[PDB]
Each structure stands twice: as C-alpha cells, then as structure tokens.
C-alpha cells in the first residue's frame, strides 16, 4: 500500500500542508467578514484567523483593497516557496511543474506589453511572482518570436513547448500572442499529464489525472467560446489549441473545433454528463470555480498523496479571491451581491 | 471582535505599539543600544 514508503521524505511536507489546510476559512467566518462595516473591521475580523497579524505594520488609513490582496497573496507565495525548499526528488519536479503554468502567463503578459510600447517596469509588476525565471525582463526586446526563442527562451524550461509554434515569421499582435499562449499551455498540460502518469504513485496518480483533466476541459470550453466571436479561424487550425487529455477529448473536442455558433457548443457539451448544466446560468466561471472546489475537497481525503499540495494551492487561491470580493464591496458600499463568494470548506 | 465595546482604545494603543516597533526596527541599521532600565522594582514587587 501507499503509506509504507511515502513518509520517508514526504511526511513532514504532508503534515505541514494538512495544517495549512486547517486554516482555510469555513462558512461562518465569511459571514462574520460579510457583516463588517468599514475595512478596519475587516482587519480586526481577519486578525482572529490564521492570517492573524499580517496587516500589522500597515496603518489604520493606508488600508486599501489592492493592498489586502497583495499581502494575502504574498503570504501564500512564501508558504509555497517554503514547501518547495523542503522537497527533493519527485516532489520537487511536481512543484516545478506547478510553477511552469505561471511562467507561461508571465511570458504572454511580457510579450503583449512590449507591443503596446509601455514601460518595462510596469509590466514587471502585476506579473505573478511565482513563475519568475531571472531572464524574464530580457523579453522586452526584438518584437518577433524568432529573436525571442533563439536568444532567451532556449535556456528556460519552457523550451520544449515551442515545437508547434513556428508557423509565423512576422511581428506579433494580440491575436498571435494568444495563439502562442494557447499552444504553450496545450504542450504544458500534455507533458505534465505524462509526468504524472509515469512517475507519481497511485492514489495521487488518479487524483492528479482527474484534476488535470478538469483543467484541460475548462481550457477547451473557454477557447471554443472565445473563437466564435469577431474572428475567422480555420477549424483544423483551432484543433491545435485544444489539449489532448480530459474527459471530453476524443469526441467532444472534434465537435468544439467545428462549432460555428453558440448552439454548436451547447450541442457538443450535451453528450457529456458532467457538463451541459453550465450554459444556462448566471456567470459561467462560477460553475468552474464551484466544480474545482468540489474536486479539491475530494483530494483532501486521500492521506498519503502529494495531490494535497495541488489541492491546498488551488483552495487558498480561491480564498484570496473571496476576501477581495468582500473587500471590494465594503470599500465601495455594494452589499447587494456580497454573498456570492464560493465556499466549500 | 469589531462589535465589542472598548475597541477604539485598542486601535489607538496598538497603533502606538506599531509605531514603537517601527522605532525599534529603526534602531537597527545604526547600531544604537536600547536603554534597558533594569529597575524592575517601581512597578512589580512588594505591596502589589
């Protein structure tokens, strides 16, 4: 069984991340945060949680909605960097593969910001400190891709993912950079699924396979619903943007690659059982966040598994989205939709 | 905790404590020793 060899190098990590799980805000703590009047009341009410004394040394009057999520994210990222420094062998590779997906978003953000002639220093902020890679600010030169890959991207770990990307030889606009980002993310999800299948042991293997399948399915549905808009894409040129894994791959990605209107997407998801309750709703991303949280809650029942390191990392990032949504309503007096946070724990 | 009485006094006094921690942190980078009055007698002791 799995507990025999797991705790030789991952027992301290397991115990620390389960203790990190225990600081997730339950449903009553969000109600107590919702009842706050001003933002100092939100600070006092968050001081009685496992965030406690993190907005110390700020002010009583320099407290802003942006600053709250900056500090609440920096806490999360220091915790991730603490767990990754205590890992070795296969867990270190697992956490580097978690990091690469943020590196891709930093790459697309830097290339997009270079085109619109703006400052390098303002693209270097708002640029997600977890996927850093020290040679990143060198991407602000030489606005075509062939002078990017041949100078700075071959040394990055994103270098194997630029295989399907060299069909243009010109400069870049907002459409081409999103095509490059979707192709990089396809190659990333397929390589990380292949790493999970061949090298992670079983109770974490099946959990990470269903979590990465959910990530691939959400990418596929959003690429299909962002391609029926004011554009014209050949249907075999769109099947190169959909990842080859998940539970809607071998049939429904054939139909999503050919959907011409909004009713072609509802017809493609009508056959899959876990979906087709999603396209008649309020928000569409509030189904994906809810289903991701029900998947992450189910991953905390497996006790000897490193999927927990995923399931914590996505849950805590949901939590920082909730607090901001409360802090955007207290600072702006918009209490009408304040109870639309997403809470499972 | 934000609805109890005597919470504005706590906010004022730990604003003062925040500023005193800033003073102690600013006594680093310029190595100046704290005074450390070792008369722990005029507050605690006999008579209570």
């Amino acid at each position: 069984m799995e507990g025999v060899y797991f705790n030789i190098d991952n027992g301290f990590i397991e115990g620390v991340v389960r203790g990190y799980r225990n600081g997730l805000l339950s449903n009553n703590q969000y109600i107590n945060l919702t009842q706050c009047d001003t933002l100092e009341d939100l600070k006092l009410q968050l001081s009685s949680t496992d965030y406690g004394n993190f907005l110390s040394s700020v002010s009583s009057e320099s407290l802003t909605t942006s600053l709250i999520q900056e500090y609440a994210s920096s806490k999360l990222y220091h915790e991730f960097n603490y767990i990754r420094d205590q890992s070795s062998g296969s867990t270190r590779k697992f956490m580097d593969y978690i990091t690469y997906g943020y590196m891709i978003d930093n790459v697309a953000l830097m290339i997009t910001g270079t085109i619109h002639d703006r400052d390098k220093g303002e693209i270097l902020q708002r640029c997600h400190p977890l996927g850093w890679f020290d040679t990143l600010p060198t991407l602000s030169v030489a606005t075509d891709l062939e002078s990017l890959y041949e100078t700075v991207l071959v040394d990055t770990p994103l270098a194997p993912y630029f295989k399907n990307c060299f069909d243009t030889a010109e400069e870049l606009d907002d459409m081409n950079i999103e095509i490059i980002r979707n192709k990089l993310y396809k190659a990333y999800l397929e390589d990380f699924y292949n790493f999970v299948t061949e090298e992670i042991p079983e109770p974490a293997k099946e959990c990470m396979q269903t979590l990465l399948g959910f990530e691939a399915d959400r990418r596929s549905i959003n690429i299909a619903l962002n391609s029926l808009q004011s554009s014209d894409i050949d249907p075999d040129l769109k099947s190169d943007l959909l990842p080859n894994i998940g539970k809607l791959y071998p049939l429904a990605t054939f139909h999503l690659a050919q959907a011409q209107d909004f009713e072609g997407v509802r017809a493609a998801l009508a056959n899959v059982y876990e979906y087709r309750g999603f396209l008649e709703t309020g928000n569409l991303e509030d189904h994906f966040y809810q289903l991701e949280m029900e998947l992450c809650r189910d991953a905390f029942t497996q006790q000897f598994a490193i999927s927990t390191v995923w399931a914590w990392m996505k849950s805590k990032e949901q939590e920082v989205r909730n607090i901001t949504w409360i802090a955007e309503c207290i600072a702006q007096n918009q209490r009408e939709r304040i109870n639309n946070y997403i809470s499972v724990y | 905790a934000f609805q109890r009485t005597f919470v504005n006094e706590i906010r004022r006094l730990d604003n003062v404590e925040r500023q005193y921690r800033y003073f102690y942190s600013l006594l680093k980078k310029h190595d100046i020793k704290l005074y450390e009055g070792d008369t722990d007698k005029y507050l605690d002791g006999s008579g209570e």
């Binding site: 004394n53 110390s56 040394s57 | 005193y20 921690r21 102690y24 942190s25 722990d40 605690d44």
Partner: peptide, 15 residues
C-alpha cells in the same frame, strides 16, 4: 497579572 515584556520578544513575534 503584569510582567516585563522585553521588546525583542515582541518585535519578532509580530512580523
């Protein structure tokens, strides 16, 4: 009760 607080055990204890 009251006790002596010793600021270095209170500056590192906060942040």
């Amino acid at each position: 009760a009251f006790e002596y607080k010793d600021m270095e055990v209170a500056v590192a204890s906060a942040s």
